[PDB]
Design a protein around this ligand. Sequence first.
Ligand SMILES: N[C@@H](Cc1c[nH]c2ccccc12)C(=O)O
Ligand SMILES: [Ca+2]
Ligand SMILES: [Ca+2]
Ligand SMILES: [Ca+2]
Ligand SMILES: [Ca+2]
Ligand SMILES: [Zn+2]
Length: 316
Amino acid sequence: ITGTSTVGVGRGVLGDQKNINTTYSTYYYLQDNTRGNGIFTYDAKYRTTLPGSLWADADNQFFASYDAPAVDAHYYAGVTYDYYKNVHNRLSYDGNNAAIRSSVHYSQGYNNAFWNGSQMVYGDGDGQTFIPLSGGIDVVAHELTHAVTDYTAGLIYQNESGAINEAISDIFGTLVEFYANKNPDWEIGEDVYTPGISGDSLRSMSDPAKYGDPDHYSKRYTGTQDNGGVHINSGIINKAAYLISQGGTHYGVSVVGIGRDKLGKIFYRALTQYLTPTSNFSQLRAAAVQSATDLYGSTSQEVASVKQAFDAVGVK
Ligand SMILES: N[C@@H](Cc1c[nH]c2ccccc12)C(=O)O
Ligand SMILES: [Ca+2]
Ligand SMILES: [Ca+2]
Ligand SMILES: [Ca+2]
Ligand SMILES: [Ca+2]
Ligand SMILES: [Zn+2]
């Protein structure tokens, strides 16, 4: 909409108060004019028609239960935008300040979220498996990272290419969570998953086998479900990214950690410079090794640690 930039206030899915950039024209809309070509949050009104209607509010206060998912989708899209801008000098997902659009209250009891090619979409969960999914900063960043991937490597969503695509979203979703610095960890979706169970999540990057996911190439899923195990074999890459950052000894192979910022730099460079739509794990190893070489030098600890991490997960 055309209007005046304003700042509203509400509460997110987890009861936390936060300010949100809005636009005033008769109503206050969830439209942040401060970030690129804007951040727009919509209400899917429990239907599956997208995007739905640009979120409108009479008084610029967003403290209703129904408001909560919108507040977070809007806010966390903005934090994710800041991350890519401040950390990687990337302007929105296309690198050209593309408008970022999100819809909440997608369908009824919908236990997922997604990038649809055009926008992020969030279910409300069924209240047992999930609460509204935009409540997880790593979930939001995960979904918006799919758009980054679409515009860069274009990793195809199947098999090894797709498991890399998934891992990239888990990796940057996690790095955004650390950037925002609110209860950061190496698990995925812990903030919105299973409101009746403490300390679980959908996936773990530090120990993927915790939730049934492979942590070594020998344990890769080779079947056809989940597009050839894209959310399953991502555990192999997530584990490598975790080791690169934090270090550790995994199946007897030792990795010296180089930290989250270097992990991000190396994987961001691999993603934007070397990965292609059909890149496999082995080609990802080469991309990451070359990326660390470009950044730190062929004889650097950083290159050695990337090599150790891929060795540790059996990716040569
Ligand atoms: N996003 C993952 C994991 C996931 C989230 N919600 C789910 C509900 C059912 C099965 C898997 C999931 C997927 O789509 O596979
Ligand atoms: Ca209101
Ligand atoms: Ca967390
Ligand atoms: Ca997390
Ligand atoms: Ca839980
Ligand atoms: Zn994903």
